[PDB]
Amino acid sequence: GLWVTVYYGVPVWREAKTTLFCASDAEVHNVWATHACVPTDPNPQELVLENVTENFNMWKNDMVDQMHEDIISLWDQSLKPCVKLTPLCVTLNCSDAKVEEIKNCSFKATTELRDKKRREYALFYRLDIVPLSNSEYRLINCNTSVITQICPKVTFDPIPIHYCAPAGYAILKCNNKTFNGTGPCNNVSTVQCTHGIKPVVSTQLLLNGSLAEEEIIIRSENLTDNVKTIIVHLNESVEITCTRPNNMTRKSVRIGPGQTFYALGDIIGDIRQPHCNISEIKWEKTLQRVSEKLREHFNKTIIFNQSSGGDLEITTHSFNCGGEFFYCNTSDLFFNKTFNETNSTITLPCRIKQIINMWQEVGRAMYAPPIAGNITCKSNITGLLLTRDGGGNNSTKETFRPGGGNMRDNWRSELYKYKVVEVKPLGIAPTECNRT
Amino acid sequence: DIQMTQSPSSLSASVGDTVTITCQANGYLNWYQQRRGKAPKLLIYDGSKLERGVPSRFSGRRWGQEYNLTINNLQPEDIATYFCQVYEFVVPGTRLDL
């Protein structure tokens, strides 16, 4: 007979693009606005396909591109209502602080009466301000941008979130134990709703990320090319925890009607330089395993060296810890660390910056209010960002350096196995059935 | 690793005939036009794709690991140095004097 027939609900899909909405698991306003995100299911379905093969290139994935877009918008939205610190940067007369880590000085600011003005003192870090020339300074960014205070109530701490597809679409993830970004993978499972993806922010060391399994996964757009970064993924995480011992104080200085901002008020106790601690023996073995994995992709001896240079954002390790922003040297880990064929730690002295140019797009900056009391944060290192020197046809050396080439690579580590796709439940198969 | 080779290193041909130069290498390749003391100018990229502005006479062919550069209908001001440029290695170019 060979009569056409229409089958509804058949397994056919093709590459497709769409918008994914937020979902969260489980009182105080959050920058991510997780209250808006719908609750996640108690037990997401993890159906696994039996015998099928598919290939995808994560570098062309748009899930990461959308994540960067909406995360950028979310930060902008949270800062719309609360005050902007535009008037603050005037001629500042600063000499030194009684307690060049921190500088103490004052400025003239408006009061309840607009015509009248008052003199108020405040504390700023040395790198926060810049010298006009003697003894006079201005905020690092007022002749090229406008600084806005971050709303004190919101908390910037990352909370796991689910990028969860809508109805009629599916997300394919394959659990190949060893598999880089590109290439086919034969064990692919369909998950409607993705798993936890913490929006951690860092520049040199990836922290609070999912660990690898069975291998030290290494991913990069092209190994031969030098511009593209190289992402490491460690199966055994390294515990890094550190605290700033200094005790701060909160002070309020005011510039307009109902508009108040918080500046560093005073230092309590003896001034002590903050630092961070890492294990000696554990970290060294971590790099040895990484060096071995890198060797087979180049067939040359692997060497490490510090960052070449640049602005403080990349040349120093940065992260979020209890509402404070850090910029640390992380140079002892990548100095003279050429690899051959105890109860001691690594000290990484560093300091804190208030005015931050995060989300490096022209136009605006941010200010992080200070908080009284010390901060403690313990994090686990999972993956590294590296950039090959690329010094031509080198004899046997391929010296490596750290540095985050682009911020988008922070989330590409956790999205290397994911792909949105549209499903068409219609088909026209051959059958002998024919309607009366 | 990246490998480069420019076998001829020198070529002298008449005007109006068909002339070409040979470069062998692995990876993306580009061709440039360098005069005496002037900045190089890009002729064709991605092996065979043409650039906007350069005359259509310049052309090339991608064959496996062998890269051609077809030059036909010569005019004056087209006599300058040619070299093939992979990401980081650039061997000395070849001259098309006459």
């Epitope: 960052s307 070449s308 640049g310 020197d389 690329g390 010094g391 050396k397 080439g405 | 993306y28 650039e51």
Partner: nanobody
């Protein structure tokens, strides 16, 4: 409209330092890399490195490693970025001409080049 300015040729005694300035104003500088090349007499081009306009992270071969330093400095407005190049020690064989290029579209193709600066030792 897209063009690059260049500093004038200068000559310095051995052991001194030299400064070469490149400017880009005809496009969105932050979206394209900048690369530096050296053209010594008697041989072909020699690579120097690149500087990312978004963040001044250099990348240089071992031959010039530790001496050449690439720095960027935007103007008052985010246009007409100026790219510099400083090296500490000059050898007797450093005489060459330094160019200023641009990378785009994932391909090491340089459609814009600087006039070049000739420096002796």
């Amino acid at each position: 409209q897209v063009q690059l300015l260049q500093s004038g040729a200068a000559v310095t005694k051995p052991g001194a330092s030299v400064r070469v300035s490149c400017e880009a104003s005809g496009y969105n500088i932050r979206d394209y890399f900048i690369h530096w090349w050296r053209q010594a007499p008697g041989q072909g081009l020699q690579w120097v490195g690149w500087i990312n306009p978004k963040t001044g992270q250099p990348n240089n071969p071992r031959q010039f490693q530790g001496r050449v330093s690439l720095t960027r400095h935007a103007s008052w407005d985010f246009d007409t970025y100026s790219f510099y190049m400083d090296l500490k020690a000059l050898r007797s064989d450093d005489t060459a001409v330094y160019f200023c290029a641009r990378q785009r579209s994932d391909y090491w193709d340089f459609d814009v080049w600087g006039s070049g600066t000739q420096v002796t030792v």
